[PDB]
Enzyme design. Structure first.
Site, PDB file in Angstrom:
ATOM      1  N   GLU A 186       0.821  -1.207   0.000  1.00 57.68           N
ATOM      2  CA  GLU A 186       0.000   0.000   0.000  1.00 57.68           C
ATOM      3  C   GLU A 186       0.857   1.260   0.000  1.00 57.68           C
ATOM      4  O   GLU A 186       0.511   2.252  -0.652  1.00 57.68           O
ATOM      5  CB  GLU A 186      -0.946  -0.010   1.201  1.00 57.68           C
ATOM      6  CG  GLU A 186      -2.060  -1.039   1.098  1.00 57.68           C
ATOM      7  CD  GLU A 186      -3.030  -0.965   2.258  1.00 57.68           C
ATOM      8  OE1 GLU A 186      -2.675  -0.370   3.296  1.00 57.68           O
ATOM      9  OE2 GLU A 186      -4.151  -1.501   2.131  1.00 57.68           O
ATOM     10  N   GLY A 265       6.459  -7.038   9.079  1.00 56.15           N
ATOM     11  CA  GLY A 265       5.441  -7.730   9.843  1.00 56.15           C
ATOM     12  C   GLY A 265       5.321  -7.177  11.253  1.00 56.15           C
ATOM     13  O   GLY A 265       6.075  -6.303  11.682  1.00 56.15           O
ATOM     14  N   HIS A 444     -26.848  -3.289 -16.051  1.00 58.43           N
ATOM     15  CA  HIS A 444     -26.033  -3.144 -17.241  1.00 58.43           C
ATOM     16  C   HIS A 444     -25.898  -1.673 -17.594  1.00 58.43           C
ATOM     17  O   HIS A 444     -26.905  -0.950 -17.605  1.00 58.43           O
ATOM     18  CB  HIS A 444     -26.651  -3.909 -18.417  1.00 58.43           C
ATOM     19  CG  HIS A 444     -25.983  -3.641 -19.729  1.00 58.43           C
ATOM     20  ND1 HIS A 444     -24.909  -4.378 -20.182  1.00 58.43           N
ATOM     21  CD2 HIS A 444     -26.237  -2.719 -20.689  1.00 58.43           C
ATOM     22  CE1 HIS A 444     -24.531  -3.922 -21.363  1.00 58.43           C
ATOM     23  NE2 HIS A 444     -25.320  -2.915 -21.692  1.00 58.43           N
TER      24      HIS A 444
HETATM   25  C1  LIG Z   1      -0.299   0.686   8.495  1.00 61.89           C
HETATM   26  C2  LIG Z   1      -1.415  -0.235   8.913  1.00 61.89           C
HETATM   27  C3  LIG Z   1      -2.523  -0.387   8.084  1.00 61.89           C
HETATM   28  C4  LIG Z   1      -3.575  -1.230   8.440  1.00 61.89           C
HETATM   29  N1  LIG Z   1      -4.656  -1.349   7.579  1.00 61.89           N
HETATM   30  C5  LIG Z   1      -5.630  -2.145   7.928  1.00 61.89           C
HETATM   31  C6  LIG Z   1      -6.763  -2.271   7.030  1.00 61.89           C
HETATM   32  O1  LIG Z   1      -6.900  -1.692   5.954  1.00 61.89           O
HETATM   33  N2  LIG Z   1      -7.741  -3.131   7.484  1.00 61.89           N
HETATM   34  C7  LIG Z   1      -7.715  -3.843   8.671  1.00 61.89           C
HETATM   35  O2  LIG Z   1      -8.671  -4.578   8.939  1.00 61.89           O
HETATM   36  N3  LIG Z   1      -6.644  -3.720   9.510  1.00 61.89           N
HETATM   37  C8  LIG Z   1      -5.662  -2.910   9.147  1.00 61.89           C
HETATM   38  N4  LIG Z   1      -4.582  -2.780   9.987  1.00 61.89           N
HETATM   39  C9  LIG Z   1      -4.572  -3.545  11.242  1.00 61.89           C
HETATM   40  C10 LIG Z   1      -5.286  -2.832  12.384  1.00 61.89           C
HETATM   41  O3  LIG Z   1      -4.742  -1.525  12.569  1.00 61.89           O
HETATM   42  C11 LIG Z   1      -5.110  -3.640  13.670  1.00 61.89           C
HETATM   43  O4  LIG Z   1      -5.341  -5.014  13.385  1.00 61.89           O
HETATM   44  C12 LIG Z   1      -6.039  -3.206  14.805  1.00 61.89           C
HETATM   45  O5  LIG Z   1      -5.788  -1.836  15.124  1.00 61.89           O
HETATM   46  C13 LIG Z   1      -5.900  -4.071  16.040  1.00 61.89           C
HETATM   47  O6  LIG Z   1      -6.738  -3.537  17.086  1.00 61.89           O
HETATM   48  P1  LIG Z   1      -6.316  -3.635  18.600  1.00 61.89           P
HETATM   49  O7  LIG Z   1      -7.236  -2.752  19.448  1.00 61.89           O
HETATM   50  O8  LIG Z   1      -6.234  -5.048  19.036  1.00 61.89           O
HETATM   51  O9  LIG Z   1      -4.873  -2.981  18.613  1.00 61.89           O
HETATM   52  P2  LIG Z   1      -4.577  -1.472  19.000  1.00 61.89           P
HETATM   53  O10 LIG Z   1      -5.575  -0.581  18.359  1.00 61.89           O
HETATM   54  O11 LIG Z   1      -3.117  -1.180  18.646  1.00 61.89           O
HETATM   55  O12 LIG Z   1      -4.727  -1.466  20.565  1.00 61.89           O
HETATM   56  C14 LIG Z   1      -3.571  -1.514  21.426  1.00 61.89           C
HETATM   57  C15 LIG Z   1      -3.418  -0.191  22.136  1.00 61.89           C
HETATM   58  O13 LIG Z   1      -3.143  -0.425  23.537  1.00 61.89           O
HETATM   59  C16 LIG Z   1      -1.873   0.100  23.879  1.00 61.89           C
HETATM   60  N5  LIG Z   1      -1.215  -0.837  24.785  1.00 61.89           N
HETATM   61  C17 LIG Z   1      -0.558  -1.991  24.447  1.00 61.89           C
HETATM   62  N6  LIG Z   1      -0.057  -2.641  25.470  1.00 61.89           N
HETATM   63  C18 LIG Z   1      -0.409  -1.859  26.559  1.00 61.89           C
HETATM   64  C19 LIG Z   1      -0.176  -1.997  27.942  1.00 61.89           C
HETATM   65  N7  LIG Z   1       0.492  -3.018  28.485  1.00 61.89           N
HETATM   66  N8  LIG Z   1      -0.666  -1.038  28.759  1.00 61.89           N
HETATM   67  C20 LIG Z   1      -1.338  -0.016  28.222  1.00 61.89           C
HETATM   68  N9  LIG Z   1      -1.618   0.219  26.938  1.00 61.89           N
HETATM   69  C21 LIG Z   1      -1.124  -0.745  26.153  1.00 61.89           C
HETATM   70  C22 LIG Z   1      -1.130   0.323  22.563  1.00 61.89           C
HETATM   71  O14 LIG Z   1      -0.190   1.383  22.700  1.00 61.89           O
HETATM   72  C23 LIG Z   1      -2.283   0.692  21.628  1.00 61.89           C
HETATM   73  O15 LIG Z   1      -2.625   2.071  21.718  1.00 61.89           O
HETATM   74  C24 LIG Z   1      -3.506  -1.934   9.651  1.00 61.89           C
HETATM   75  C25 LIG Z   1      -2.401  -1.786  10.482  1.00 61.89           C
HETATM   76  C26 LIG Z   1      -1.354  -0.941  10.125  1.00 61.89           C
HETATM   77  C27 LIG Z   1      -0.170  -0.799  11.046  1.00 61.89           C
HETATM   78  C1  LIG Z   2     -28.990   6.512 -24.838  1.00 60.89           C
HETATM   79  C2  LIG Z   2     -29.464   5.238 -24.188  1.00 60.89           C
HETATM   80  C3  LIG Z   2     -28.801   4.756 -23.063  1.00 60.89           C
HETATM   81  C4  LIG Z   2     -29.212   3.582 -22.436  1.00 60.89           C
HETATM   82  N1  LIG Z   2     -28.518   3.144 -21.318  1.00 60.89           N
HETATM   83  C5  LIG Z   2     -28.917   2.042 -20.743  1.00 60.89           C
HETATM   84  C6  LIG Z   2     -28.191   1.582 -19.574  1.00 60.89           C
HETATM   85  O1  LIG Z   2     -27.222   2.137 -19.059  1.00 60.89           O
HETATM   86  N2  LIG Z   2     -28.684   0.410 -19.038  1.00 60.89           N
HETATM   87  C7  LIG Z   2     -29.764  -0.315 -19.515  1.00 60.89           C
HETATM   88  O2  LIG Z   2     -30.090  -1.351 -18.924  1.00 60.89           O
HETATM   89  N3  LIG Z   2     -30.440   0.126 -20.616  1.00 60.89           N
HETATM   90  C8  LIG Z   2     -30.029   1.245 -21.191  1.00 60.89           C
HETATM   91  N4  LIG Z   2     -30.704   1.693 -22.302  1.00 60.89           N
HETATM   92  C9  LIG Z   2     -31.846   0.910 -22.793  1.00 60.89           C
HETATM   93  C10 LIG Z   2     -31.438  -0.213 -23.740  1.00 60.89           C
HETATM   94  O3  LIG Z   2     -30.770   0.319 -24.884  1.00 60.89           O
HETATM   95  C11 LIG Z   2     -32.686  -0.971 -24.192  1.00 60.89           C
HETATM   96  O4  LIG Z   2     -33.529  -1.184 -23.066  1.00 60.89           O
HETATM   97  C12 LIG Z   2     -32.389  -2.318 -24.850  1.00 60.89           C
HETATM   98  O5  LIG Z   2     -31.338  -2.159 -25.805  1.00 60.89           O
HETATM   99  C13 LIG Z   2     -33.606  -2.936 -25.506  1.00 60.89           C
HETATM  100  O6  LIG Z   2     -33.171  -3.895 -26.492  1.00 60.89           O
HETATM  101  P1  LIG Z   2     -34.057  -4.233 -27.749  1.00 60.89           P
HETATM  102  O7  LIG Z   2     -33.369  -5.317 -28.583  1.00 60.89           O
HETATM  103  O8  LIG Z   2     -35.449  -4.541 -27.332  1.00 60.89           O
HETATM  104  O9  LIG Z   2     -34.030  -2.887 -28.589  1.00 60.89           O
HETATM  105  P2  LIG Z   2     -33.047  -2.606 -29.801  1.00 60.89           P
HETATM  106  O10 LIG Z   2     -31.653  -2.928 -29.407  1.00 60.89           O
HETATM  107  O11 LIG Z   2     -33.279  -1.164 -30.257  1.00 60.89           O
HETATM  108  O12 LIG Z   2     -33.551  -3.583 -30.935  1.00 60.89           O
HETATM  109  C14 LIG Z   2     -34.382  -3.111 -32.017  1.00 60.89           C
HETATM  110  C15 LIG Z   2     -33.595  -3.145 -33.305  1.00 60.89           C
HETATM  111  O13 LIG Z   2     -34.422  -3.683 -34.362  1.00 60.89           O
HETATM  112  C16 LIG Z   2     -34.658  -2.698 -35.351  1.00 60.89           C
HETATM  113  N5  LIG Z   2     -36.062  -2.768 -35.746  1.00 60.89           N
HETATM  114  C17 LIG Z   2     -37.133  -2.226 -35.088  1.00 60.89           C
HETATM  115  N6  LIG Z   2     -38.288  -2.445 -35.669  1.00 60.89           N
HETATM  116  C18 LIG Z   2     -37.952  -3.185 -36.794  1.00 60.89           C
HETATM  117  C19 LIG Z   2     -38.726  -3.736 -37.834  1.00 60.89           C
HETATM  118  N7  LIG Z   2     -40.055  -3.622 -37.912  1.00 60.89           N
HETATM  119  N8  LIG Z   2     -38.079  -4.419 -38.803  1.00 60.89           N
HETATM  120  C20 LIG Z   2     -36.750  -4.537 -38.729  1.00 60.89           C
HETATM  121  N9  LIG Z   2     -35.917  -4.063 -37.800  1.00 60.89           N
HETATM  122  C21 LIG Z   2     -36.584  -3.392 -36.854  1.00 60.89           C
HETATM  123  C22 LIG Z   2     -34.246  -1.358 -34.741  1.00 60.89           C
HETATM  124  O14 LIG Z   2     -33.793  -0.464 -35.752  1.00 60.89           O
HETATM  125  C23 LIG Z   2     -33.112  -1.789 -33.809  1.00 60.89           C
HETATM  126  O15 LIG Z   2     -31.874  -1.914 -34.500  1.00 60.89           O
HETATM  127  C24 LIG Z   2     -30.310   2.879 -22.955  1.00 60.89           C
HETATM  128  C25 LIG Z   2     -30.976   3.356 -24.078  1.00 60.89           C
HETATM  129  C26 LIG Z   2     -30.563   4.530 -24.701  1.00 60.89           C
HETATM  130  C27 LIG Z   2     -31.302   5.023 -25.917  1.00 60.89           C
END
Ligand SMILES: Cc1cc2nc3c(=O)[nH]c(=O)nc-3n(C[C@H](O)[C@H](O)[C@H](O)COP(=O)(O)OP(=O)(O)OC[C@H]3O[C@@H](n4cnc5c(N)ncnc54)[C@H](O)[C@@H]3O)c2cc1C
Ligand SMILES: Cc1cc2nc3c(=O)[nH]c(=O)nc-3n(C[C@H](O)[C@H](O)[C@H](O)COP(=O)(O)OP(=O)(O)OC[C@H]3O[C@@H](n4cnc5c(N)ncnc54)[C@H](O)[C@@H]3O)c2cc1C
EC number: 1.8.1.15
Lengths: 459, 459
Positions: A186, A265, A444
C-alpha cells in the site's frame, strides 16, 4: 489502593466495550500510547486517506489514454498531511475526554503490567508510573507492535515504520521499502503515485505471497515495471549518508536512498504483559483464547491483535462484540455465551491494482482434496472494462463441483474491495454459484458484471 | 415464397436467441438499422464510455481539493470519439457476418412489416424492399425509438438525439438539453465535465422525478449549482442562428445556444409493425405479453422495449432468455415454461453524483399501507468517506418493520451501481436487514461500510 470492577488494557477495539450496561460499575482504562488505538492514529484510517490522494494523482498521469491531456503542477505534501491528521488528531482528544471525564471511568496513560493474583480473586495491575489497582474482570486489548530485522537494528541506521512514516516533512526523492506484506504494498502505491522513486527489497519470490499465486504472480509482474523490485535479497548493513541512507545487501550490492521504510510484519504485545504472573497462558507470542474469548484465567478476556490470528480491524471488532456479551454472562454459562465466528474472513490491499480476497485459494482447496471448478474472468471482457480500457484486471472464483457453493474469491483490479462484497455474502450465508448468477439482477453496464460473467464462465 | 421455421425482428436482445438447438432450421433475421441493436451502437455501451472519460476529467479539475495541483491542457474530443466507436463499429460488422455467412440463417436489412396471416396458419412477413416470406414462429424484438416534442418538430430547428449527438465533430461551447430523464441527466454530466456549458430546460419541478423524492430533491439541488436549471419551461419555437440555435420558451424568454439535445423519452416500435393484421394484440403502444412472453397470437413471442414496461438491457436479456426456452416448448404446455422475473428490478443513472436504486420508494410503500422503517446514512460518516472528503453521498434504505426484510434501496454517490449489488442480492433472495449487517464480514476501511452502517442504523 483503588478497587475497580473491570479494567481494560488498550483503547483500540477495547474502547468499544464500556456501554450503558456498565453505567453502575467502576471501570479503569489503560493506554500507554495515544488514545484511539492503532487503526485511527497510525493505521487503517490515515493510510487509506493517503491512498485516495495517490489515486487522484494516478488518474491525472494516465488521463492522456482517454483523450484528456493533463499534467500535475505540484504535489503539496504538506497540505496533504495537514488535511489527513487535521481530521484524525482532534478525534483522539475528544474520545479521550469522553472517557476520562466520566466519573465512573478512570484512565491510566502508562504501561500496565499484570501482578500476582490476590487472595480474594481480584487481579492486581501495576503501571510504569507506580499505580496499583485491582479489578474483578480484566480485558486484554494490547494489540501488536512492529518488528524490525535484527540486522537493521544492529546497523544503527535511521529507519521508518508504519507508525512514523506518515508524518514526514518532505517527500523523498528515492525510498527503499523492506517487506512484502500488505503494508509494504500500500505504501509503494502511495509514494509512486505522488512522484517518488520506489524500490522494493523483498526476501521471497512473490509480493503478497499469502494471496493466491495467480494474483501474486500477475501483480508482482505489474509492480516490477513501475517499481524497482529486488527479489531474494536481504539488508545486512547500512550507514548514514547525510539526510539519506546507504544500505548494503546480502549480495554485496549497495543502494543509496533518501528514506528507509521497514514493513517486515508485526507481532502481538502480549510479551510485555507479565501474563504468566497472573495465570494467563501464552503460546508462541500470542494470548490463548477459546471460542468465547476466555483465557486460562477466571474472569480474564482477550481480543484483538494480542490473541487473534487475523490482524484485521473488522475481525477485532467482531471479537469486541463477543467480549461485550460474554462478559456480563457468568464464566461457566457457556450455553448463554456467544461464539466468535472466523469463517470466511476477507482482506484487502489498497495498491495499484487493488486486491481483495476471501476464502480458500486454488492450491488450498487442492491440499484439502476438494473437487473444484475454477474460472478466471478478465475486466476487458465486460462492457464496463471497455470504458476503462482495462488490460490486467481479473476476478478469480473457486467453487466445489459437487455442492456448487463458493470456496474462494480472489479479485485483483478496480474497486476490488467493493465487488468482493456480494461474493462475501454468498459464502457467509451459503448461496451456490448458480443462484448468484441467475437468481438476481445485475445492472447493465455496471462494474459487478465482471463478477456475474465470472460465475457464468465456471465451466 | 421462402419457408422458414422461425423469424426474429430485431438484432438487439433478439440476437441472443438463435442457439445450437436451431442448427437445422432455416431462420430469418431482420434489421432495418445497424446490426447489434441500440445498446451497443447508439446506446448504453458508447454512452458509458464517454461517462468514464468525463469522470476522468472531473477528477483532474477537483484534484486541488486533495492536495494535488493539476490542470487540463487539452480535451482531444476527436480522439475520444474515434477510440469509442473504433471499438464498437467493427463489432456490428462481425456480428452481421456471423449470421449472414451461416447457411441456415438469412438476413434481411430493410424494415419488416406484418402481412395477412396465410391460410395454413403461417405468418406472412413483408419487408420494405419488396421481399415476401413466411415463418412458423415469430419473435418480436423491435425495441423502441426516441420521442421528439411536436413543437420542436414543427419549428424546423436542427435538433440532436441520443442516436446522433455522440458523433459530433467538435465540442460546442454551450449546449441546451430538453428533458429530465436518465438520458438527459447522464449527457449533462458528460459535456459539463468536458468543459461545455450545460442548460437544462425541464417541464417538471425536479430532475429525475421517477426516482425517490429524497434523491431527486438532493440531486436537483446539486445539479442546479453546476448546470443552469430552468424548471417548468417548455420550448415553443426556435430558429437557426448559424451553427447554433435560438429557442423560444413558454415564458417569452429566448435562449441562444450552439447545440440542441432532445431527451424527452422514447416510445415502443410496435406501432410501425401492422401487428393487428396478424392477431397480436397491442396496448398503449407496446405488444401485450403474458408471464411466459406469449402474445395473443399462437407461436408469436415478444421481448425487449417493444413489450416490456422496463426499458433496460438486463431486463431485455432476461426476457430473451425466457423466449429462448419457451419457444422450443409447445404453445399450450404452460407448465413446462419459465416465468419472467420482475420482482427486484434495478436501475442506474450514471451522472454526478451516480444514482442506483432497486425496489419501491418511500412514497410508494406509504401508498400501499406498509409499516416501514427508513434510514438515511451519509457517505461522510464512514472511513472511506473521510478519504473522499465526501459531503453529499447518501444511502437510503426502507424495510418492513414486521418481517424485517428490505423493501427498497436508493443510493446517490460514488460507486452507486456497485454498492447496490449486495442490496439487490438480499432483496432477491429474502435476506433480512439484521442478517445482512451482522451475519457477514465487511472489509475495513472499504467503501461498502456505508451500506453496513445504513443497515445498522435502521430502527
Ligand atoms: C499501516 C497499517 C494499516 C492497516 N490497515 C488495515 C486495514 O486496511 N484493514 C484492517 O482490517 N486492519 C488494518 N490494519 C490492522 C489494524 O490496525 C489492527 O489489526 C487493529 O488496530 C488491532 O486492534 P487492537 O485494538 O487489538 O490494537 P490497537 O488498536 O493497537 O490497541 C492496542 C493499544 O493499547 C496500547 N497498549 C498496548 N499494550 C499496553 C499496555 N500493556 N498497557 C497499556 N496500553 C497498552 C497500545 O499502545 C495501543 O494504543 C492496519 C495496520 C497498520 C499498522
Ligand atoms: C442513450 C441510451 C442509453 C441507455 N442506457 C442504458 C443503460 O445504461 N442500461 C440499460 O439497462 N439500458 C439502457 N438503455 C436501454 C437499452 O438500450 C434498451 O432497453 C435495450 O437495448 C432494448 O433492447 P431491444 O433489442 O429490445 O431494442 P433494440 O436494441 O433497439 O432492438 C431493435 C432493433 O431492431 C430494429 N427494428 C425495429 N423495428 C424493426 C422492424 N419492424 N423491422 C426490422 N428491424 C426493426 C431497430 O432499428 C433496432 O436496430 C439505454 C438506451 C438509450 C437510448
Amino acid at each position: 489502593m483503588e478497587t475497580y470492577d473491570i479494567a481494560i488494557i488498550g483503547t483500540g477495539s477495547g474502547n468499544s466495550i464500556l456501554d450503558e450496561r456498565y453505567a453502575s460499575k467502576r471501570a479503569a482504562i489503560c493506554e500507554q500510547g495515544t488514545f484511539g488505538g492503532t487503526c485511527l492514529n497510525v493505521g487503517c484510517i490515515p493510510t487509506k486517506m493517503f491512498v485516495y490522494a495517490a489515486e487522484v494523482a494516478k488518474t491525472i498521469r494516465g488521463a492522456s489514454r482517454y483523450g484528456i491531456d493533463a499534467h500535475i503542477d505540484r504535489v503539496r505534501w504538506d497540505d496533504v498531511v495537514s488535511r489527513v491528521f487535521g481530521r484524525i488528531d482532534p478525534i483522539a482528544l475528544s474520545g479521550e475526554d469522553y472517557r476520562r471525564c466520566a466519573p465512573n471511568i478512570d484512565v491510566y496513560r502508562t504501561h500496565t503490567r499484570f501482578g500476582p493474583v490476590q487472595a480474594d480473586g481480584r487481579y492486581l495491575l501495576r503501571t510504569d508510573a507506580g499505580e496499583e489497582f485491582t479489578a474483578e474482570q480484566v480485558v486484554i486489548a494490547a494489540g501488536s507492535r512492529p518488528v524490525i530485522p535484527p540486522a537493521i537494528l544492529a546497523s544503527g541506521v535511521d529507519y521508518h515504520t508504519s507508525d512514523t512514516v506518515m508524518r514526514i516533512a518532505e517527500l523523498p526523492e528515492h525510498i527503499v521499502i523492506v517487506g512484502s506484506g500488505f503494508i509494504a504494498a500500500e505504501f509503494a502505491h502511495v509514494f509512486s503515485a505522488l512522484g517518488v522513486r520506489v524500490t522494493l527489497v523483498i526476501r521471497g519470490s512473490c509480493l503478497l505471497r499469502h494471496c493466491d499465486d495467480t494474483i501474486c504472480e500477475r501483480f508482482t509482474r505489474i509492480a516490477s515495471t513501475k517499481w524497482e523490485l529486488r527479489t531474494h535479497r536481504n539488508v545486512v548493513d547500512g550507514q548514514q549518508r547525510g539526510s539519506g541512507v546507504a544500505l548494503r545487501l546480502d549480495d554485496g550490492c549497495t543502494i543509496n536512498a533518501d528514506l528507509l521504510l521497514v514493513a517486515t510484519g508485526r507481532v502481538s504485545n502480549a510479551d510485555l504483559l507479565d501474563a504468566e504472573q497472573a495465570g494467563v497462558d501464552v503460546e508462541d507470542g500470542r494470548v490463548i483464547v477459546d471460542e468465547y474469548q476466555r483465557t486460562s484465567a477466571r474472569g480474564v478476556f482477550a481480543l484483538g491483535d494480542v490473541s487473534s490470528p487475523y490482524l484485521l480491524k473488522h475481525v477485532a471488532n467482531h471479537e469486541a462484540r463477543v467480549v461485550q456479551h460474554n462478559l456480563l454472562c457468568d464464566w461457566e454459562d457457556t450455553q448463554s455465551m456467544i461464539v466468535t465466528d472466523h469463517r470466511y474472513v476477507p482482506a484487502a490491499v489498497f495498491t495499484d491494482p487493488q486486491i481483495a480476497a476471501v476464502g480458500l485459494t486454488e492450491n488450498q482447496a487442492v491440499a484439502k482434496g476438494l473437487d473444484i471448478s475454477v474460472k478466471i474472468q478478465d475486466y476487458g471482457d465486460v462492457a464496463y472494462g471497455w470504458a476503462m480500457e482495462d488490460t490486467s484486471g481479473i476476478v478469480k472464483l473457486i467453487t466445489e463441483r459437487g455442492s456448487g457453493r463458493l470456496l474462494g474469491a480472489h479479485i485483483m483490479g478496480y474497486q476490488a474491495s467493493s465487488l468482493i462484497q456480494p461474493l462475501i455474502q454468498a459464502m457467509s450465508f451459503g448461496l451456490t454459484a448458480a443462484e448468484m448468477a441467475r437468481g438476481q439482477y445485475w445492472i447493465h453496464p455496471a462494474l459487478p458484471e465482471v463478477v456475474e460473467n465470472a460465475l457464468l464462465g465456471l465451466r
